[PDB]
Amino acid sequence: HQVYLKDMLHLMRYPEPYTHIIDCRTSTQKMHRWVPHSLWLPRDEVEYALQLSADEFLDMYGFRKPDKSDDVILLSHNGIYSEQAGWEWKKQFFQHVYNYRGGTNELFGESYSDMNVSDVLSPWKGPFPQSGVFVDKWSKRKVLTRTGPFDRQYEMQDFALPDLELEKARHPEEGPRQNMPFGLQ
Amino acid sequence: SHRRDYIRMGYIPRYTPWEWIAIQEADQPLIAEQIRQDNIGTSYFFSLNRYW
Amino acid sequence: THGLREKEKHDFTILQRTVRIPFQGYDMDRFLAQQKGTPYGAQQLPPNVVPS
Amino acid sequence: FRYTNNLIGALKHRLLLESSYREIASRKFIGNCRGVEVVCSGYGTVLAVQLTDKAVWESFYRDLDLDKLAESIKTALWDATRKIRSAKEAALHRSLSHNTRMRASADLKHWYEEDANTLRPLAFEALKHEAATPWMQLVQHGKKEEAAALLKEFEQKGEQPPLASTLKAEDSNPATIPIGSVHPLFTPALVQIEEAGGGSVSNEAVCRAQLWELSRDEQLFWERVELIRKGQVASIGSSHKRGYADEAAFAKDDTEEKVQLRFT
Amino acid sequence: QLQAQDRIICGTHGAGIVAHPAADLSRTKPHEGTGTSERDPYIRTLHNQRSAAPESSVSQSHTVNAPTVDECEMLAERWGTMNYWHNDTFPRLVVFLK
Amino acid sequence: RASRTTAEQQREEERAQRFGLGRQGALVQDGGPDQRTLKKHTNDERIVDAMLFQQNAYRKTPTDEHWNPYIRRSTENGVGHLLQNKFDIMRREDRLSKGEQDLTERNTIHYGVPIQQIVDEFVFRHRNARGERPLDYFKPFPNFRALRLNRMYRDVEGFSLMKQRPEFLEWELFTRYRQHHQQRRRLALLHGLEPVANETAQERDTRRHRLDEICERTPFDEREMRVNDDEMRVSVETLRSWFGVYMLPSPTVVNAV
Amino acid sequence: YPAAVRYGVELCTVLTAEGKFVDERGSGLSARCVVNGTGAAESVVFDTANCNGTNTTSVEDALRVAHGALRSAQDRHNTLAAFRLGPLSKQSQVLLFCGVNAYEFGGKYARTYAYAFEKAKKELEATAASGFMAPSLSHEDTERLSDQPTTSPSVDRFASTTHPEQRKAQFVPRVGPGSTPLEDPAADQKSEWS
Amino acid sequence: MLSQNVAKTTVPSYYMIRTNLPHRKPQNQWEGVYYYSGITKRQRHLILLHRKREREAHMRSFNISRASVLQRLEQLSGDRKQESLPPHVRLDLAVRLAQHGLYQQATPIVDELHHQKALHAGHYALLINALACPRLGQRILHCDAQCDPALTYKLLGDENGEERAQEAYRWFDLALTSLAVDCGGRTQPSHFVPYLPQGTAAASHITNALMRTLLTCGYTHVAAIPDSVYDRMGSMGISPTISTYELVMLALSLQGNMVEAESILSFLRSHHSEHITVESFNALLLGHREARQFDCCDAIWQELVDRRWPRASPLTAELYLRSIMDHANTPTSEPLQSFANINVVEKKKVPLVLAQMDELGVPRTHLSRVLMDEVEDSLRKFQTYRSRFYEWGRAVKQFDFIEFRRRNGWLYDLHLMKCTTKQVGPLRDFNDPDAVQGAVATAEIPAFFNERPAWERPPLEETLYVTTNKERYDDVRGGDIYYDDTRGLHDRSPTWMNEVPETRYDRLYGVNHPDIAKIGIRRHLNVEYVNRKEVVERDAALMKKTLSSGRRLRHRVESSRTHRNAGS
Amino acid sequence: ANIPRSVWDPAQHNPNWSDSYGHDITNRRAWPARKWTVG
Amino acid sequence: KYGVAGQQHWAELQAAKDEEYIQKLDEAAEVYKQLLDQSARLDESRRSEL
């Protein structure tokens, strides 16, 4: 479930006795500010942290382990590490695990990225993967599936930009599509 | 619902249970004018020369 | 969650096959009273258990 | 969110009960039995005992039938106490029925917890409140400005419920109860956040306490993260970590890896 | 016609043709039970609603009962059939004349 | 102090053993720190956490899912949520103290198992219930009365004490008495003297006396007598020879008595 | 501490005291009465043996002496309750005053408690204004989207507020009574009759 | 993208020409026609806001009336306290105060009036009726009783009914005394003293007022009306009236006792005909609704329809309609909840009772707003005309319903969209196992009919495991086109440590019992740091001597017969 | 009530209603035709 | 000898046999999946050999 900036500000102004705000930001060289009412639990060590007992968690991370019934809010740089941490907590069967997708970037105006994942996917190189080849179960005819070179990610990218000027600059003056016949545009 | 041999052992019921009766009745609406009710009478000079 | 409670219910169901209708007596009130030991002369002393 | 909602519901219930106590303490309760009426205040203290009609009851009571008179007086007192307890319990019932935040908790316990024996108006606490002077009553009820004005003015210069000069009709309004008076049990702790003058909450005190707690927690957090980083660097080699890769669902695209190279 | 039917059919879980480590302080669903004894069967076969015998099929306007004191008092105002007035048992015209 | 701390440790250790708490071996495995091996019909900390999660994953209040009346009016956990006013609370407690059914428990409609369904299940489990069916069920053309089941009906009341297996000819005497009462009620219906609804003791006594007077002079109908399954066709004279005439008296015996 | 104070108040509620009064005017009649602690009386009697050979006292004198005996008994019971509950009350006072940091109304959470108290006052005033019927827990009766609190259940928390099959509390979608949806009900489905 | 848009159509090939396979599934005969009877999630907000505004308006009106009566009291009694107010002015002020829920202020006024003998026979009954707080009841009905007359009595009793009940009893006794005095004065020469004032009609009116105001005091007084008040009336000799009998019926109905409530009306029916009003009928309806006897409620409504006299009131219609609504909004048990809730069908008879109301002359608009909302919902659910029936269930409408279901992610129950990938085989019997069986007919029956036993199934499968049903890409000769792959929620790669960032737990290297206290940061963080290993070892060392204390040799002394020998 | 109580209320039980198997067994039974020594 | 105890004991024996065959079938499913993967790899190699 999601947590919003207004909720975070409300919690900062009025903390609750049993609402644990966990910071999952690793690489403390990139960490510079302290989130209010927050305890630092590294994303790389969260798997072992949930395995540790109450005392084993306390003497290892400096603060007592929140119980399952207690709600825990996870904050990271962009929400990716915090979302993976939330997945780990929910796999460990914690009841209320919320993720603040706004993150440190929204809360403090920082540009740090926890994952630096490039949304654009590199163009496909090579043949169609045989794992995506499907055959019908009656006539034994092999067909194709939306994978490999023909992917829905590739369709979402290389699409018309929301800006008219940008799209007009992208395409030549003649038209958007001209290498195709008149009846195929 | 309690029966576990409904079609595995061929326990086909020849009477439709009241639960299914209620479900099938409540699935569809009711025609409001399907009920007959009148006390004014018959329009001798109208009810036939109505709007087109 | 293990489900042994409905296993108990199923064991009761399969045990019901071997049971038979009990005999409530021709005079049911008389029979129940005699089982309770209430009527005159129907008192039965409990068995003399051995002392420890 | 759960804590805030539960606290709001509980505080609304306590506010209703406190307003009920303030409105009941400044009231009259009359028990009548065979012409002898006993009038008692909201705290159960007997205000008066008197005969309603002498002409029709003196002959009935006859010398004088002290047994009959005493039984009638006891019956009247019991009836008055029954009325007081019923009024308090009915106010509790009204609060419970009108509160929905508490109703969200599916517990029958709340209807019996604060029954008509542990509410604020108590007979064994009647003397400590009703026999007090008006300044004492004001300070106990939380009228800081009224008590200050009375102390500065009156002391410098030189049949009815006694607890009526302070508990007035407007005091029964919900927007009058001080934070230090809403909860009798936690009054010595709640009086700290309440400002010295006025029943309103002074935001400066709570902000200062929160700021001190935040400073301590921030310093402790920084010490903890420093120690964790030192331990991690000690337990690993070079101060760098292996990368994290996204599983996703895209194809591996290992066609180029299959290509080899030989020599002729 | 069934003997002791009020406790065999309308009172016993299972109509009397069924035989009878469960945890304590346990809330069970109304359609079943722990199964410890007859009063708490594994499956409750008795409804929790109101019980009512079927409406009597005996004719009410034709049977002529014994006259009551209030009926005799109101006999002059009350109407009735010819068989009501000259009933084989408890005639009403004779009571009116008396 | 040692006894207290040892008691605490023992209670914690026994609870942990019973519920399988703690990791199953090494904390840092090659294939992840969480490596649980579930066994059939065994307790586990993961199982307990999973059931708690299923019950109250994102539960803010116990009545979170009470937006629909069908869930709201459920009587599984209790009637606390259904009760909402002191009038209802007092009514419920008064009914419980008086022994009558609580009205709040009617908020959940519960039709039981119909008697026809119970009989059908019994017969299906008992393979035609051949042990309970009457002997007439195995005759060529049984009717519904010998085709339904074997119960006990309100015709054996107030007869000579009979054990599980009655003595010789006692059941035949009972059948004779039953036929006698059937003829008695037939005579009562043929003549007047019918049992009326609102009859006082005096009217009942007069009716019964006149019925006895008119029935003591009416001969018993031999043809109406019939046997059900294996009852031996024994004559009235034979029954008198066995049990004494006083059981089936002649009119002169009745007058003498 | 709450258990201790509840025990004390219940014990003082059930314990009874006694008080006696003697008339200082005219006949020297006296009365003695017991009080149960709820303000009522289990037994009030008059003693006439001390009275001389007059028997001329009226009803008002007996009423006055009974009132005096009742007042004496009430004061006696109040003093007894004060002496019974004194030390526990004082120790609880100092404990609560000096241990605020170990409480929800002390330290970082005092501001939260004050905010909750103020919002509870506002909600009670709103309920009083709106015919003694509380506003819906989820603020569905608010005309403005800016009036619903941040903590109110009105605001959604599900990720992917647009795409279904992801607006569910648990891993797998659940159904309620029968086959109705449970994770996200519809307006006609969440009927709140009675 | 949602994982419910299964490709129903197979891959194009020569099969579609060579074989006789249908290109669509047959129509489902027992599937209802889809029609729209929902709420846009905004109409509910609109109706809630409207109801809140109406409730606020009612509260404002009541507060204005109460402020007016308080101001009148302050300016009349508090001002002219010395001035002798007229008896009628004091009486009307007391009546207004009692009606507006202010019993405390009115009591001294009525006591003074009784002392001054201004009160009279009708005035006592008027005061007792005013003590029932009719204005407070009218406020609470439309504000916080949800327009429920049954709940109105309970709420009004919770409004400090015990004090009002005691005042009502006291006023009843005073009224009896006044009636006795007045009858003695008026009937001096007629020699009718012993039969008065219980024989008078004033006594009946006053006791009827007392019972009517006791109905709004609480459960104790409501239950005591027919148990104590009725018996007291009989013992005193006051003749009951139709109002008395109907108040007794209403009290019994509120208690829930229905046999007695039916018995008293049966007595009235058998003896006192042409005297029964609609109050008895609606009291019986309210009682059956309270006792969950909706069948009896419907029977009473049908009887009232059959016998036109007395006329059915809007209160009676509202009671019956909300009894129907409560019956329709009641769940069955788990065995009956297998498919759907069956009590929803009880709202299908709402149009029938509305037509009966129109025939009888009962206004449809004279109902409460909340009940009208439920009636509108019922009519939307089970109401249609011939015009709408001639065009409902068009292809465009059905496909729009399907699109709405797709957008909302609920495609399980749609015939054109549901896909049955799993099938069920036969069960081989241990007796005669040499014979093979075969299918003769196929039906789409739900899973719970043949669901495997709970004990023969992994516990908490839904959360412990994730199961995905998907089709195999390769050709399968045997079959099982769509197979389910089940993976544990905690499934991990076997070489998990190699594809994760290096952590500080690798020093442990798979030890069963690591020294996490020694490797933790808390030891350096804190100063004192009581150590569990150290405290355990210290306690063991300190307690071993007490655990094993040992024994010592005890000296024995020869016991003499006449004394005890000493030693040193 | 959309479900008559004469189908679930034991107070309105039908004594004469047999089970679902006895009648079928009986009318399936075909008794031997050799009742008499001749014919 | 035992009307219900014998039934329950035979049920236990049958349950043991069913559990053994269930684990054997799980092993068979695993090896069948491995065979499917091997066949897919072989078919891809045969396709790309030319």
Short mmCIF file of N, CA, C and O in Angstrom, two decimals, chain H residues 455-515:
data_model
loop_
_atom_site.label_atom_id
_atom_site.label_comp_id
_atom_site.label_asym_id
_atom_site.label_seq_id
_atom_site.Cartn_x
_atom_site.Cartn_y
_atom_site.Cartn_z
N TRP H 455 -7.44 -31.31 5.10
CA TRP H 455 -6.26 -31.98 5.62
C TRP H 455 -5.41 -32.58 4.50
O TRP H 455 -4.19 -32.69 4.64
N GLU H 456 -6.03 -32.96 3.38
CA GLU H 456 -5.28 -33.42 2.21
C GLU H 456 -4.99 -32.27 1.26
O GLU H 456 -5.25 -32.33 0.06
N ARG H 457 -4.41 -31.20 1.80
CA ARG H 457 -4.12 -29.98 1.06
C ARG H 457 -3.16 -29.13 1.88
O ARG H 457 -3.30 -29.04 3.10
N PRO H 458 -2.16 -28.52 1.25
CA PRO H 458 -1.22 -27.68 1.99
C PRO H 458 -1.94 -26.57 2.74
O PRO H 458 -2.78 -25.87 2.16
N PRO H 459 -1.66 -26.41 4.03
CA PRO H 459 -2.34 -25.36 4.80
C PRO H 459 -1.97 -23.97 4.31
O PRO H 459 -0.82 -23.71 3.94
N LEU H 460 -2.96 -23.08 4.34
CA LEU H 460 -2.78 -21.68 3.94
C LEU H 460 -2.12 -21.58 2.57
O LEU H 460 -1.14 -20.86 2.38
N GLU H 461 -2.66 -22.34 1.62
CA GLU H 461 -2.05 -22.43 0.30
C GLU H 461 -2.05 -21.08 -0.41
O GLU H 461 -1.08 -20.72 -1.09
N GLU H 462 -3.12 -20.29 -0.24
CA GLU H 462 -3.27 -19.05 -0.98
C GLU H 462 -2.14 -18.07 -0.68
O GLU H 462 -1.61 -17.43 -1.60
N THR H 463 -1.76 -17.93 0.58
CA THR H 463 -0.69 -17.01 0.94
C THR H 463 0.68 -17.67 0.92
O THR H 463 1.67 -17.03 0.55
N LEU H 464 0.76 -18.94 1.32
CA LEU H 464 2.05 -19.62 1.37
C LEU H 464 2.62 -19.87 -0.02
O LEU H 464 3.84 -19.90 -0.19
N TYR H 465 1.76 -20.07 -1.01
CA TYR H 465 2.20 -20.37 -2.37
C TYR H 465 1.54 -19.40 -3.34
O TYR H 465 0.46 -18.86 -3.08
N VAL H 466 2.22 -19.17 -4.46
CA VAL H 466 1.65 -18.45 -5.59
C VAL H 466 1.52 -19.44 -6.74
O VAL H 466 2.51 -20.06 -7.16
N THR H 467 0.30 -19.61 -7.23
CA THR H 467 -0.02 -20.53 -8.31
C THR H 467 -0.50 -19.75 -9.51
O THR H 467 -1.43 -18.94 -9.40
N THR H 468 0.13 -19.98 -10.66
CA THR H 468 -0.23 -19.31 -11.90
C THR H 468 -0.61 -20.36 -12.93
O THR H 468 0.14 -21.32 -13.15
N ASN H 469 -1.77 -20.19 -13.56
CA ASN H 469 -2.24 -21.11 -14.59
C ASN H 469 -1.92 -20.51 -15.96
O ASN H 469 -2.40 -19.42 -16.28
N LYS H 470 -1.12 -21.23 -16.74
CA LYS H 470 -0.73 -20.74 -18.05
C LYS H 470 -0.61 -21.91 -19.01
O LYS H 470 -0.51 -23.07 -18.61
N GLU H 471 -0.64 -21.59 -20.30
CA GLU H 471 -0.58 -22.60 -21.35
C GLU H 471 0.85 -22.86 -21.78
O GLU H 471 1.69 -21.95 -21.82
N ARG H 472 1.13 -24.12 -22.10
CA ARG H 472 2.45 -24.50 -22.58
C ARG H 472 2.65 -24.04 -24.02
O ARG H 472 1.74 -24.11 -24.84
N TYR H 473 3.86 -23.54 -24.31
CA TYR H 473 4.16 -23.10 -25.66
C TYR H 473 4.45 -24.26 -26.60
O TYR H 473 4.15 -24.18 -27.80
N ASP H 474 5.03 -25.35 -26.09
CA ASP H 474 5.37 -26.48 -26.93
C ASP H 474 4.15 -27.37 -27.16
O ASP H 474 3.14 -27.28 -26.46
N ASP H 475 4.26 -28.23 -28.17
CA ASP H 475 3.19 -29.16 -28.48
C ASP H 475 3.16 -30.31 -27.48
O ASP H 475 4.19 -30.88 -27.13
N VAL H 476 1.95 -30.65 -27.03
CA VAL H 476 1.75 -31.73 -26.07
C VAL H 476 0.82 -32.75 -26.70
O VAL H 476 -0.34 -32.44 -27.01
N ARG H 477 1.32 -33.98 -26.88
CA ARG H 477 0.47 -35.05 -27.39
C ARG H 477 -0.49 -35.55 -26.32
O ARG H 477 -1.67 -35.79 -26.61
N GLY H 478 -0.01 -35.70 -25.09
CA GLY H 478 -0.86 -36.23 -24.03
C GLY H 478 -2.02 -35.31 -23.69
O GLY H 478 -3.16 -35.76 -23.58
N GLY H 479 -1.74 -34.02 -23.54
CA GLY H 479 -2.79 -33.07 -23.24
C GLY H 479 -2.39 -32.02 -22.23
O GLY H 479 -1.23 -31.62 -22.16
N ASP H 480 -3.37 -31.55 -21.44
CA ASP H 480 -3.16 -30.54 -20.41
C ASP H 480 -2.58 -29.26 -21.02
O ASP H 480 -1.44 -28.86 -20.75
N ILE H 481 -3.40 -28.63 -21.86
CA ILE H 481 -2.98 -27.43 -22.57
C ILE H 481 -2.63 -26.33 -21.59
O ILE H 481 -1.60 -25.66 -21.72
N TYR H 482 -3.47 -26.12 -20.58
CA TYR H 482 -3.24 -25.13 -19.54
C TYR H 482 -2.86 -25.84 -18.25
O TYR H 482 -3.67 -26.59 -17.69
N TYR H 483 -1.64 -25.62 -17.79
CA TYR H 483 -1.15 -26.21 -16.55
C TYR H 483 -0.86 -25.12 -15.54
O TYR H 483 -0.58 -23.97 -15.89
N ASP H 484 -0.95 -25.49 -14.26
CA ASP H 484 -0.71 -24.56 -13.16
C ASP H 484 0.67 -24.82 -12.58
O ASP H 484 0.96 -25.94 -12.15
N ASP H 485 1.51 -23.79 -12.55
CA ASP H 485 2.79 -23.85 -11.87
C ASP H 485 2.65 -23.20 -10.50
O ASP H 485 2.20 -22.05 -10.40
N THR H 486 3.02 -23.94 -9.46
CA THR H 486 2.94 -23.48 -8.08
C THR H 486 4.35 -23.28 -7.55
O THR H 486 5.15 -24.22 -7.56
N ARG H 487 4.65 -22.06 -7.10
CA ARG H 487 5.94 -21.75 -6.51
C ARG H 487 5.72 -21.19 -5.11
O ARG H 487 4.80 -20.41 -4.89
N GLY H 488 6.57 -21.61 -4.18
CA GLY H 488 6.46 -21.11 -2.82
C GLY H 488 6.74 -19.62 -2.76
O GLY H 488 7.54 -19.08 -3.53
N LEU H 489 6.05 -18.95 -1.83
CA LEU H 489 6.26 -17.52 -1.67
C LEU H 489 7.69 -17.20 -1.25
O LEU H 489 8.21 -16.13 -1.57
N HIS H 490 8.33 -18.13 -0.55
CA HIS H 490 9.70 -17.95 -0.07
C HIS H 490 10.72 -18.65 -0.95
O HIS H 490 11.85 -18.90 -0.50
N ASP H 491 10.36 -18.99 -2.18
CA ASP H 491 11.31 -19.62 -3.08
C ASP H 491 12.44 -18.66 -3.41
O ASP H 491 12.21 -17.49 -3.72
N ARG H 492 13.67 -19.17 -3.35
CA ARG H 492 14.86 -18.37 -3.61
C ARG H 492 15.78 -19.13 -4.57
O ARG H 492 15.71 -20.35 -4.68
N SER H 493 16.62 -18.38 -5.26
CA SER H 493 17.63 -18.99 -6.11
C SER H 493 18.61 -19.79 -5.26
O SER H 493 18.98 -19.35 -4.17
N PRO H 494 19.03 -20.97 -5.72
CA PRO H 494 19.95 -21.78 -4.90
C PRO H 494 21.25 -21.09 -4.57
O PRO H 494 21.78 -21.24 -3.46
N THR H 495 21.81 -20.34 -5.52
CA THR H 495 23.01 -19.53 -5.28
C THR H 495 22.63 -18.07 -5.03
O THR H 495 23.03 -17.16 -5.76
N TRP H 496 21.87 -17.85 -3.95
CA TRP H 496 21.33 -16.52 -3.69
C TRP H 496 22.41 -15.53 -3.28
O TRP H 496 22.32 -14.35 -3.61
N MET H 497 23.44 -15.99 -2.56
CA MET H 497 24.47 -15.07 -2.07
C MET H 497 25.28 -14.47 -3.21
O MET H 497 25.84 -13.38 -3.05
N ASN H 498 25.37 -15.15 -4.35
CA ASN H 498 26.23 -14.67 -5.43
C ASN H 498 25.63 -13.49 -6.17
O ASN H 498 26.37 -12.67 -6.72
N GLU H 499 24.30 -13.37 -6.20
CA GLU H 499 23.64 -12.28 -6.92
C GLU H 499 23.04 -11.25 -5.98
O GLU H 499 22.05 -10.59 -6.31
N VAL H 500 23.62 -11.09 -4.79
CA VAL H 500 23.19 -10.05 -3.86
C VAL H 500 24.42 -9.27 -3.41
O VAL H 500 25.53 -9.82 -3.42
N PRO H 501 24.28 -8.00 -3.03
CA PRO H 501 25.44 -7.24 -2.55
C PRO H 501 26.04 -7.87 -1.31
O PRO H 501 25.34 -8.41 -0.46
N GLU H 502 27.37 -7.79 -1.22
CA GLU H 502 28.08 -8.35 -0.08
C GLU H 502 27.68 -7.63 1.20
O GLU H 502 27.67 -6.40 1.26
N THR H 503 27.35 -8.40 2.23
CA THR H 503 26.86 -7.87 3.49
C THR H 503 27.85 -8.18 4.62
O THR H 503 28.91 -8.77 4.40
N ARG H 504 27.47 -7.79 5.83
CA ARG H 504 28.30 -7.99 7.01
C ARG H 504 28.02 -9.31 7.72
O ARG H 504 28.65 -9.59 8.74
N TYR H 505 27.09 -10.11 7.20
CA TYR H 505 26.76 -11.40 7.79
C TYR H 505 27.54 -12.55 7.18
O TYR H 505 27.37 -13.70 7.61
N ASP H 506 28.40 -12.28 6.19
CA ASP H 506 29.16 -13.35 5.55
C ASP H 506 30.24 -13.92 6.46
O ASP H 506 30.70 -15.04 6.22
N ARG H 507 30.65 -13.18 7.48
CA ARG H 507 31.62 -13.71 8.44
C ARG H 507 31.06 -14.92 9.18
O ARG H 507 31.82 -15.81 9.57
N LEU H 508 29.74 -14.96 9.38
CA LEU H 508 29.13 -16.09 10.07
C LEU H 508 29.34 -17.38 9.30
O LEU H 508 29.62 -18.43 9.89
N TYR H 509 29.21 -17.33 7.97
CA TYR H 509 29.54 -18.45 7.09
C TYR H 509 28.73 -19.70 7.42
O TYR H 509 29.24 -20.82 7.37
N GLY H 510 27.46 -19.51 7.76
CA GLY H 510 26.57 -20.63 7.97
C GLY H 510 26.65 -21.30 9.32
O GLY H 510 26.27 -22.47 9.44
N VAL H 511 27.14 -20.60 10.34
CA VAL H 511 27.15 -21.17 11.69
C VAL H 511 25.74 -21.17 12.25
O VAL H 511 24.95 -20.24 12.02
N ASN H 512 25.40 -22.23 12.99
CA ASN H 512 24.05 -22.36 13.53
C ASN H 512 23.77 -21.32 14.60
O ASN H 512 22.68 -20.75 14.65
N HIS H 513 24.75 -21.04 15.47
CA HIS H 513 24.56 -20.15 16.61
C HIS H 513 25.63 -19.06 16.58
O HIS H 513 26.64 -19.15 17.29
N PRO H 514 25.44 -18.02 15.77
CA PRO H 514 26.42 -16.93 15.71
C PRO H 514 26.42 -16.10 16.98
O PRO H 514 25.45 -16.04 17.73
N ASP H 515 27.56 -15.44 17.22
CA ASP H 515 27.68 -14.49 18.34
C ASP H 515 27.24 -13.10 17.87
O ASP H 515 28.03 -12.16 17.73
#
